[PDB]
């Protein structure tokens, strides 16, 4: 519904841990790669974002 | 041209009539179904909306 559809991309630091990714915001690196969305597909998995 | 694409889906009442569809607005039911348009195709017909 948003005017500009977009999704970010960040990079994780060493020793990946999903619980800390959803608990705290420090695990991810400050660097980021923002980009606009094209089109959803979801051919096999229910989450296949380009 | 509009920023957000969308469309509403309604249900017609008993005794369908094309002339009533262009003559009166009471044929449609009070129930409605807004949704977002996905993508136009018009492969064979000029109106193949999803």
């Amino acid at each position: 519904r948003l005017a500009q559809p977009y999704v970010g991309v960040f990079l994780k630091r060493d020793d990946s841990n999903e619980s800390d990714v959803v608990e705290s915001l420090d695990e991810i690196y400050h660097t980021g790669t923002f980009a606009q969305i094209h089109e959803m597909q979801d051919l096999g998995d229910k989450l296949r974002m380009i | 041209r509009l920023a957000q694409p969308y469309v509403g889906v309604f249900l017609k009442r008993d005794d369908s009539n094309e002339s009533d569809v262009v003559e009166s607005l009471d044929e449609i039911y009070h129930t409605g179904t807004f949704a977002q348009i996905h993508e136009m195709q018009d492969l064979g017909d000029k109106l193949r909306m999803i």
Binding site: - | L11, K12, D14, Y29, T31
Partner: protein, 50 residues
């Protein structure tokens, strides 16, 4: 038989993915062949058990 059965295998109640059961009961009532008037009659009811 009317539709293919993998879609039933894709959304299963034991996966705990049915956060919204009313969409599943609507998808299952959609398989009925009843008149669109009869669907409107089902819509006229307000209480969930009814």
């Amino acid at each position: 038989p009317l539709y293919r059965e993998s879609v039933l295998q894709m959304m299963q109640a034991g996966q705990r993915v049915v956060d919204n059961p009313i969409y599943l009961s609507d998808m299952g009532a959609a398989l009925t062949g009843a008149e669109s008037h009869e669907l409107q009659d089902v819509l006229e009811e307000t209480n969930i058990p009814k």
